[PDB]
Amino acid sequence: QDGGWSHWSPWSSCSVTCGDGVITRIRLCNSPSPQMNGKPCEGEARETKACKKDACPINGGWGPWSPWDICSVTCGGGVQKRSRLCNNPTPQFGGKDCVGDVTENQICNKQDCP
Ligand SMILES: *[C@@H]1O[C@@H](C)[C@@H](O)[C@@H](O)[C@@H]1O
Ligand SMILES: *[C@@H]1O[C@@H](C)[C@@H](O)[C@@H](O)[C@@H]1O
Numbered sequence: 792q793d794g795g796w797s798h799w800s801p802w803s804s805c806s807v808t809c810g811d812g813v814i815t816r817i818r819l820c821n822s823p824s825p826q827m828n829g830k831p832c833e834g835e836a837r838e839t840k841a842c843k844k845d846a847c848p849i850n851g852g853w854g855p856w857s858p859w860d861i862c863s864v865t866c867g868g869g870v871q872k873r874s875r876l877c878n879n880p881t882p883q884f885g886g887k888d889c890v891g892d893v894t895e896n897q898i899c900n901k902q903d904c905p
Contacts, residue, residue, distance in 0.1 A: 854879035
């Protein structure tokens with residue numbers, strides 16, 4: 792017998808909770824099922840349409856550490872500092888801040904003086 796399409800399914804929810812997603816619905820060649828000697832169902836069994844929502848949060852990335860500062864002293868124990876920025880990338884769309892220190896300090900030229 793000739794194939795026959797069911798009614799469509801409901802649309803799924805949007806595939807994604809932010810950014811550009813998709814919604815799907817499906818139909819079966821069962822109304823009736825092409826039993827034998829018969830023409831199939833005409834068209835595709837699935838529609839995918841697009842769904843679009845607000846931009847996905849962009850979490851903070853650490854950019855690269857500054858070259859160390861020059862040591863506070865040429866001998867007998869000093870400090871040097873370096874720094875970094877949360878802008879690789881910058882937190883966007885309620886994305887999370889970077890985790891860890893903006894700064895580092897370390898000893899340098901601990902070698903006893905003449
Ligand atoms: C679903 O909810 C949205 C708001 C964001 O938190 C997404 O990362 C998540 O997939
Ligand atoms: C840097 O070099 C060391 C060895 C000493 O000469 C210091 O007094 C100087 O500033």
